[PDB]
Amino acid sequence: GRRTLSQRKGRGSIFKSRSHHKLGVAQHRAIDFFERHSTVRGLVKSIEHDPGRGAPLARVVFRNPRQYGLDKELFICAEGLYSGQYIYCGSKASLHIGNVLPIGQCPEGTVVCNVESKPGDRGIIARASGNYATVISHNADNETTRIRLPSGAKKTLKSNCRAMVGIIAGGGRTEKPILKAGVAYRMYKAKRTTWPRVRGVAMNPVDHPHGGGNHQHVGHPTTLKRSSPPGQKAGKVAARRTGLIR
Amino acid sequence: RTKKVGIVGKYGTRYGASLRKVIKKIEIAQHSKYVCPFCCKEAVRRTACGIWECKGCKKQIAGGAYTLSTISGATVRSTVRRLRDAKNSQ
Amino acid sequence: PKQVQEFKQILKLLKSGSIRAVRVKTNGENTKFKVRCAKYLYTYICADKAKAEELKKAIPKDIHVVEIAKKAP
Amino acid sequence: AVRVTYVRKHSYNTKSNGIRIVKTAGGNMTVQHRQKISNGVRCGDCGCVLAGIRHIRPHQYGWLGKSKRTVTRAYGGVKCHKCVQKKILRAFLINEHNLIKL
Amino acid sequence: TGHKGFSYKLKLGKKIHQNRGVPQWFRMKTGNTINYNFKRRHWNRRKMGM
Amino acid sequence: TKGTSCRGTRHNKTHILCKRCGKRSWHLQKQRCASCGYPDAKMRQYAWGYKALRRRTQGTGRMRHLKIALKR
Amino acid sequence: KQAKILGRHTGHGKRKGTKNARTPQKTLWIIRMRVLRRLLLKYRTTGKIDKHMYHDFYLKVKGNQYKNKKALMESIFKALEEKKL
RNA sequence: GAUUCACGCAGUGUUAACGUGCAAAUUACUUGUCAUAUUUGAGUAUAGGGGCGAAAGACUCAUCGAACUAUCUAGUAGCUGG
RNA sequence: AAGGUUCCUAAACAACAUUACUUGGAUUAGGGUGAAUCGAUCCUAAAUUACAGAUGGAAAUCCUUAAGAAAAGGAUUGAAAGGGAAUAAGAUUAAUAGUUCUUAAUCAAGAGAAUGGUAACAUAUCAUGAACUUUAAAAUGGAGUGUGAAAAUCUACGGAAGAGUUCUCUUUUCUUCUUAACAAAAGUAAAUUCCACUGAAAUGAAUCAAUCAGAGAAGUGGAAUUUAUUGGCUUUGUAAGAAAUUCAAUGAAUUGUGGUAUUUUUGCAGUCUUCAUAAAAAUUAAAGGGAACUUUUGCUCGUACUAAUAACCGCAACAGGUCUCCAAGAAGCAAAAUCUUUAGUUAAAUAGAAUAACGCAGGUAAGGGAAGUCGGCAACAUAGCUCUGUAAGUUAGCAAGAAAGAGUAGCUCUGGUGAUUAUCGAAUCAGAACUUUAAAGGUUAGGGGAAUCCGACUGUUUAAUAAAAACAUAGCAUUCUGAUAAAUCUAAAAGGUUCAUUACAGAAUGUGAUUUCUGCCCAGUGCUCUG
């Protein structure tokens, strides 16, 4: 047999990300006293376009409070942020658009984007373009708050997690129909190498498990167990229900 | 010069009736000057996917990928505004 | 190469001790006193033949003076 | 109509290998290495080019006279005159505002 | 080539120095069977591969 | 065009002369010699290449300072 | 070339190229306005016409109403007489 | 990711030429294509039940439905020749 | 890049270049490669590799700044096409010359607490400026239009010198009339961005296109920057003493001024396009802050030659393959085909004779016109441009160069399209007489129509018998995953890829544009369950 395309994608020979023109890691600033127990002031110097994502990155320039000099940062742009803005990122910050707040201060129903998953990891949840997570409730007994992730699942987080208020910019990106092959090929300029995707049933029996015979077809159910060996795990993995939803 | 296929007449005859009508709505918005919230002018012109630069008075406003402010991104501005004021007073 | 513009500097320059050698070219109409200093080569284009004679007497005897004509040396 | 040849070992028309053809004594035409085109300075707030400073190479600024690479003004050389007129009013009107606030 | 490193030029120089025939006086010795150089080569016959 | 036609673009050398063995066996991209096992400290000797041992081993060279010690 | 000046050879069977190729349609109109808009500025600077009249003639020229320079000075001459009534 | 001419490139047809050739795959005419899913140089990455593949079991130094080289190896053969 | 002495000269021809050679990239012997300014050297890119650490029976593997008492913040290598301190003209050699000689420059490292303008901003180094911090340059996609400048070509006026034709004429046809690096400021431009006075409506200003204005248009006066070195063009030093063209036998003569012409090169201005936004460091300058003219040296390495129908790779002097720079005339829309000028060559696996068959390559033909054949295979025919006209179908965009018809030569004329106040300049369009051999056709140069099947389209593939109806593709749809996860590489691992990521996302799949529609079936085999 052979090693199918999903088995060669794990080594990373030609499938590494084309992250050469990328601006940098977009995240909050490191946790400290001036943010835990006070507020800082950040200036949104300019909005930039980090290649390989549909959400613009804003270049916020703080001041070093402990030392002398600037503390340049890189924030994902919430919608509505403009050049020359003043955004305050602290625990006592005011509930405006772009002001980073601990998730435990936002009133129920507040919109928070770029929420942390654990206090101090600087942004995990709701980072893509046009997405946001909505606070649900609070629980002062154990200092945990419920939010609704953009997938609809609801997760419980500590109240110290930071979460910039608002929705992420560049929303409604996918509503435009890519019309051609070229436009879809240029979309993967700053991503991995996976665009022209050849069907399993249009393959010889070695390359893919779906390699058909004298008629182009599958032959065995595509719904597989989760505990299949890598290489035979094709089609739909652990499918609870297949077919069009009626 | 053309009865109904206004901007998508550059695609000729080779993408389908529905898709060329769907993309007509988006390419129109993508290439129009919006009223600039600060300088108060029809000068905001898109530069990248989600970065609108007011050419009138030199500001870079973020927004939707094809419109200056998405519908779901304007209620959140009002939703936060409603939640902020009530929180202040009781 | 640089050019001096009037009599004030050319007379002052020759009296200075930095001068290495002096060349004079006699064209059909004018004459250039291409003095050669340590660094550059300064030349004054004189059209009045009388004003050249007083320039022809200002060169110190301690340097080489070459008078050129329609034939190169 | 004289056909010339590159005088350096560079044989490819790269950015650093631009040449200009000039005439020469006797009708000969020779090759000269012309330098690249560079950008001027930009204000640190608005990103607009500054006046009074030439657009030359980074090292060529060293050979310029000390007054040929600045502009004689507060923040002269790093911020435009509009970029500085606004700095003064901010640094003054703000001080008056919080003088009476507290 | 036009641009050769120093340790590469001196090895070419030895490969032209070794591409010489037997000296005339050597072949006139007694019991001297070394009449021709069989380690020779040329630029158009055998590329020395180096 | 797998024969004569495609043999025209062969001018990018792969193996250059090595420094410890002197053969044209230094792979430029792999940065190691295929015949004498460069930067690897040990000389590369394999038992299946019994001929490749007698082509270069002890005794095949000048023996500048070893022909003396054994004589003594 | 001397004979071609008198139109000796510029026939219909001695053309192998399109009408737009020999006489570009863009450069016959780039020059047409530069001929006209220079006259409009010349009269306004001279003082024959005013800014309000020169404005309604700037757009009229821009809309391809006057075919040549002669057919514009006639219209200026015409519209000046209606002014004094 | 419109129609075409050219520099180039390919290889649709003649199932033309040659078929102990110019050529271990080339030549001529005809045909297509000739800048955005474009052509190309150098450096770097991916190596044998592995790699790479707009998918033909194709390409991996004139070798691929499992490369080249060496050791087991003078492998075994109820089969052919001496 | 590759080759390595093939480069130049002399002698020589046994061998080799499918005959021969006095020739040779072949035999022998000598000669030749000159750098402070060109490159390497220096910096970083995709990437690569060390000490300590972790993993491993073992070989060794992983991490590259994280695990470290290591390196102010992080080590090595990585580009002769990326970044980069500084050089040109003439001449010389049998060959080397941005490398030598003459002349003329440039760079680096040394050595010997100021004024002016209202303002934009400006002063042959000047006019102090440490720690720390910031800004900027180095530093960046593409398409199309307009324009400034230079060079080439063409051309107007006036010439100087030489060459060609001349029994038939031609004040005729041709050649030469040039100038560098680096610097200076007589004169004089185009574009863009700013400043001061005033404050626009009867709205104006302007471009080929746009675009702009009471957070301030137009007007007048200024400032700065770009335009192949200073300062863009002419001009000047360099510099005529060089060089080119002539004359005399070393010595003599000349080197004005234009163009509203075509192309190339290099900049500028705005416009358009991206679900593409189109590198880093060395190195340099300024700001915030206020701590305290001369002369010397410039080391190492490459430099010859071919760069190909004979110097490279193909067993070779192989019709194959191999990345670039410079670019004249005629003619045309065209860097097309065809002919010529500067340059290269007449030899590149041997020739003479005769003019049989059968051939390869190129042609033509009476009358008929696919009856030949598996099949219009092969061949023939239409072809440029202008005007008139152009169906069914259709996703309303297309079909369309649909189909069809008329014109096209030569000579002599006329008119239209502009700048300056009558002169001057451009190829372009239209029209009228007269003549003939009745005119795109030397070369270049669409055959057309009516139907059916498949694929939606541009695109890709079996190098060497399959170029498509296959593969891809945008569209439709399905499944899992909250990130310590899903997929998934490794024997192992504070190990690796998507992930510099976070559900508008990652991974695994089937069908293949648009329109219309996806019916009944959960028994069987899979998958799933909160039973």
Side-chain angles (χ1 to χ4, degrees):
Chain A
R2 282 275 263 268
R3 272 218 203 150
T4 97
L5 190 61
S6 57
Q7 305 216 251
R8 318 205 276 93
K9 273 174 144 149
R11 325 163 61 257
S13 89
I14 81 181
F15 299 98
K16 284 169 321 180
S17 176
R18 308 162 203 179
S19 90
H20 183 235
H21 296 324
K22 302 232 194 137
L23 301 182
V25 200
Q27 58 190 12
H28 297 306
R29 69 197 288 276
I31 219 171
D32 35 359
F33 169 78
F34 304 97
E35 175 274 334
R36 274 191 282 228
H37 289 58
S38 151
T39 104
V40 295
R41 172 177 95 184
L43 156 80
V44 195
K45 198 92 218 150
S46 74
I47 326 294
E48 284 156 3
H49 169 269
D50 175 36
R53 109 166 63 201
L57 267 64
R59 272 211 182 273
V60 198
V61 171
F62 295 83
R63 303 265 331 170
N64 219 345
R66 51 202 73 83
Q67 259 199 298
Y68 182 55
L70 286 181
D71 192 49
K72 283 166 244 190
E73 284 297 332
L74 197 54
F75 281 12
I76 294 200
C77 213
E79 172 158 337
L81 299 201
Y82 63 111
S83 291
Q85 204 183 354
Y86 284 135
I87 54 178
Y88 312 95
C89 321
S91 55
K92 325 207 148 49
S94 46
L95 176 60
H96 292 67
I97 294 270
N99 274 328
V100 158
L101 293 165
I103 184 191
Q105 307 281 329
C106 291
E108 295 91 308
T110 316
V111 179
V112 279
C113 74
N114 201 350
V115 197
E116 314 192 6
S117 163
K118 150 195 313 194
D121 62 353
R122 317 150 78 155
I124 291 290
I125 289 158
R127 287 154 59 78
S129 84
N131 263 128
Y132 60 95
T134 307
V135 196
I136 290 301
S137 89
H138 294 311
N139 189 12
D141 213 338
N142 42 357
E143 217 202 23
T144 62
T145 88
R146 289 261 276 191
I147 55 150
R148 164 153 31 78
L149 314 184
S151 48
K154 285 197 246 142
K155 204 174 164 185
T156 290
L157 303 173
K158 315 294 281 204
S159 316
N160 313 328
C161 297
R162 266 159 320 166
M164 143 191 269
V165 179
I167 78 145
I168 308 267
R173 195 209 328 135
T174 38
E175 93 207 314
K176 179 166 190 171
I178 317 159
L179 253 188
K180 342 179 210 167
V183 187
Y185 159 71
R186 304 278 193 177
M187 165 181 38
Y188 295 96
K189 209 226 191 170
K191 322 208 153 233
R192 11 79 232 288
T193 307
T194 88
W195 176 50
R197 202 194 69 75
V198 183
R199 276 157 326 140
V201 315
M203 267 185 177
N204 271 125
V206 279
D207 316 69
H208 209 243
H210 295 336
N214 277 355
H215 271 105
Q216 256 196 49
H217 68 292
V218 180
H220 49 84
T222 67
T223 54
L224 301 175
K225 276 185 120 310
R226 168 94 72 203
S227 96
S228 288
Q232 99 157 89
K233 203 180 307 163
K236 298 150 221 314
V237 197
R240 302 182 240 287
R241 151 202 187 76
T242 36
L244 190 51
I245 330 174
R246 283 329 218 199
Chain B
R1 285 163 304 254
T2 285
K3 299 199 305 287
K4 68 172 90 150
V5 266
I7 189 172
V8 299
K10 76 210 186 144
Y11 300 119
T13 167
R14 56 177 170 269
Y15 292 108
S18 187
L19 310 197
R20 294 204 315 266
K21 289 315 137 276
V22 163
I23 234 182
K24 180 179 208 198
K25 162 173 102 102
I26 315 180
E27 300 218 282
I28 277 304
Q30 195 176 353
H31 304 147
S32 40
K33 319 174 189 186
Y34 291 76
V35 177
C36 189
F38 315 107
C39 348
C40 274
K41 276 187 157 105
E42 310 89 355
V44 153
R45 284 201 70 91
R46 199 187 91 151
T47 57
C49 173
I51 296 151
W52 299 73
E53 199 233 0
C54 201
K55 181 197 157 59
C57 84
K58 274 172 81 92
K59 288 249 186 182
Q60 267 178 291
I61 302 148
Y66 310 122
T67 42
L68 187 49
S69 63
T70 40
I71 325 180
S72 99
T75 87
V76 174
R77 188 175 310 128
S78 298
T79 281
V80 161
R81 174 176 88 77
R82 193 209 68 235
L83 283 155
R84 176 203 327 143
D85 294 308
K87 158 212 191 99
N88 258 346
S89 87
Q90 186 160 234
Chain C
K2 314 207 105 88
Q3 191 200 357
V4 292
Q5 318 265 350
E6 74 260 45
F7 255 90
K8 303 323 146 295
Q9 329 74 347
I10 183 84
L11 270 193
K12 166 206 100 56
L13 186 70
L14 286 133
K15 308 324 190 164
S16 308
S18 69
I19 276 275
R20 217 199 51 191
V22 165
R23 320 154 200 196
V24 34
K25 168 117 202 88
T26 40
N27 294 320
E29 48 269 38
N30 63 17
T31 283
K32 320 177 170 161
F33 285 92
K34 319 175 197 167
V35 312
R36 143 64 66 184
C37 304
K39 225 202 172 180
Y40 305 112
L41 169 137
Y42 301 95
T43 157
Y44 173 69
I45 307 188
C46 67
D48 193 89
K49 297 327 150 213
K51 315 195 100 189
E53 312 273 42
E54 87 212 319
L55 276 193
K56 290 210 194 48
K57 304 332 161 193
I59 321 90
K61 283 313 189 149
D62 220 298
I63 74 183
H64 184 217
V65 183
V66 40
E67 298 245 3
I68 327 185
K70 218 128 56 181
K71 178 76 65 166
Chain D
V2 162
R3 299 170 281 202
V4 314
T5 66
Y6 276 166
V7 208
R8 310 171 169 205
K9 289 317 181 75
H10 310 312
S11 35
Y12 300 80
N13 186 65
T14 318
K15 309 292 309 201
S16 84
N17 200 32
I19 62 136
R20 158 168 200 182
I21 300 190
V22 312
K23 287 186 78 47
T24 284
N28 223 347
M29 271 206 228
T30 196
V31 176
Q32 288 163 3
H33 170 257
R34 68 143 203 285
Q35 61 164 31
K36 283 170 267 170
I37 310 282
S38 294
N39 306 325
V41 280
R42 319 217 144 222
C43 164
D45 304 65
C46 67
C48 89
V49 289
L50 317 181
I53 302 157
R54 303 207 30 210
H55 306 343
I56 43 189
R57 281 327 223 173
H59 65 76
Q60 285 210 227
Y61 276 118
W63 313 342
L64 271 200
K66 319 258 145 59
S67 64
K68 311 259 303 201
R69 32 180 189 247
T70 88
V71 174
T72 314
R73 193 208 317 121
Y75 293 75
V78 316
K79 267 155 200 52
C80 74
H81 70 272
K82 275 146 124 183
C83 317
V84 173
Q85 228 185 327
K86 289 155 48 98
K87 274 169 91 87
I88 313 186
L89 299 156
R90 269 194 281 267
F92 159 64
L93 294 153
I94 284 166
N95 280 353
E96 310 312 304
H97 166 234
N98 70 342
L99 251 176
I100 77 191
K101 161 174 77 196
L102 50 147
Chain E
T1 335
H3 315 299
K4 32 212 158 204
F6 183 46
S7 318
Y8 188 32
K9 182 183 169 158
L10 288 209
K11 294 189 182 17
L12 307 183
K14 196 177 179 94
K15 257 85 160 174
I16 321 157
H17 174 65
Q18 298 179 334
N19 185 254
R20 303 190 94 143
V22 199
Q24 180 51 231
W25 53 267
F26 195 97
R27 319 157 56 161
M28 257 191 320
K29 284 194 203 211
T30 71
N32 199 241
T33 81
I34 309 186
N35 275 311
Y36 287 123
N37 215 26
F38 74 89
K39 291 197 188 202
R40 262 187 126 162
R41 48 153 254 285
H42 213 357
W43 66 277
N44 64 351
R45 285 292 137 251
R46 168 188 102 83
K47 307 299 168 180
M48 52 191 195
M50 92 150 276
Chain F
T1 88
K2 53 174 77 167
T4 285
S5 320
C6 90
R7 248 85 168 123
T9 36
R10 317 182 59 235
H11 55 110
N12 294 304
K13 274 175 176 155
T14 326
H15 288 91
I16 80 163
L17 313 161
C18 182
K19 198 196 225 161
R20 194 175 46 184
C21 38
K23 281 172 98 158
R24 176 158 71 131
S25 273
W26 170 270
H27 190 359
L28 286 175
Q29 262 148 345
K30 276 185 202 184
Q31 280 161 118
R32 96 187 314 269
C33 187
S35 153
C36 61
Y38 209 0
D40 181 36
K42 291 210 175 207
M43 292 268 317
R44 174 190 155 254
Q45 292 164 132
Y46 286 123
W48 44 260
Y50 70 131
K51 268 196 206 198
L53 283 150
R54 62 159 99 143
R55 286 193 241 240
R56 173 185 64 226
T57 183
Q58 196 203 91
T60 57
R62 200 201 304 213
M63 254 177 301
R64 194 194 297 214
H65 318 112
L66 183 52
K67 94 211 310 178
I68 293 315
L70 309 188
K71 247 174 253 193
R72 155 175 27 215
Chain G
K1 307 264 217 145
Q2 262 164 9
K4 259 178 204 119
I5 288 203
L6 324 173
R8 279 302 158 264
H9 298 281
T10 89
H12 263 300
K14 308 275 120 178
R15 310 173 185 174
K16 302 297 181 311
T18 36
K19 182 207 268 279
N20 166 283
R22 320 179 30 119
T23 97
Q25 218 178 353
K26 188 170 185 96
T27 78
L28 286 174
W29 156 275
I30 291 184
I31 285 166
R32 188 209 291 178
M33 318 213 79
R34 275 172 195 170
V35 160
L36 291 173
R37 297 184 217 190
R38 265 205 321 266
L39 169 76
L40 289 184
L41 172 54
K42 197 197 59 123
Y43 281 164
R44 198 203 75 211
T45 324
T46 290
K48 277 210 61 175
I49 56 179
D50 60 83
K51 38 138 78 172
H52 312 282
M53 170 157 328
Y54 158 90
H55 188 87
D56 89 10
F57 281 146
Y58 201 110
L59 305 165
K60 251 173 208 166
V61 170
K62 187 167 134 52
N64 181 38
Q65 184 115 3
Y66 310 119
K67 313 190 329 151
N68 39 21
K69 193 200 174 208
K70 255 170 64 209
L72 170 63
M73 340 185 304
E74 159 217 325
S75 280
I76 287 171
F77 194 30
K78 211 184 103 69
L80 276 182
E81 302 336 325
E82 322 196 271
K83 145 154 291 301
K84 48 95 180 175
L85 303 179

